Amino acid sequence: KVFGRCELAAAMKRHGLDNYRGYSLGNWVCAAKFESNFNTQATNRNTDGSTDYGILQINSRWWCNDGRTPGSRNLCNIPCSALLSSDITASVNCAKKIVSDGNGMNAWVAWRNRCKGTDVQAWIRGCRL
């Protein structure tokens, strides 16, 4: 599913991501834009052999099982395919675990490089939320 901006903001809010761990909703929308272009089906393989999945590009080395990432773990207890669904529930629940792992949203390098410190409130401007 390719979400619209306000559509994704609304879905993230209904799943409790708005201000989760102190990260306002625009942070999450910004991260999703740069991670996946708002596309739930996005996948990207990394040099280490892991793959990032879904709207928030969650990685198979730690967070989900894809069967082809040696030595990796599955801390969200899900197949990585679950992260590609139209329904963002699984990605949100897993992102809550990731952002709670110690480094906040710096766990998403694209958030650190492209969203952190910027006017992230712009990502939700105009939305009926």
Stretch that binds Cl ion, among 2-10, 17-25, 57-65, 88-96 (CB under 5 A): 17-25
Query: Can residue 74 be called a binding residue for Cl ion (CB under 5 A)?
Result: no
Give residues 20-59 in contact with Cl ion (rule: CB under 5 A): 24-26
Binding partner of residue 92 among Cl ion, Na ion, none, CB under 5 to 8 Å per kind?
none
52 is catalytic: yes
From the list 7, 18, 48, 52, the catalytic residue is: 52
Beta bridge partners of 51: 45
Binding partner of residue 26 among Na ion, Cl ion, none, CB under 5 to 8 Å per kind?
Cl ion
Taking CB under 5 A as the criterion, the residue among 5, 79, 93, 104 binding Cl ion is 104
**Dihedral angle sign, alpha carbons of residues 37, 117, 105, 109:** positive
Mapping DSSP onto H, E and C, the string for 13-65 reads HHCCCCCECCECHHHHHHHHHHHHCCECCCEEECCCCCEEECCCCEECCCCCE
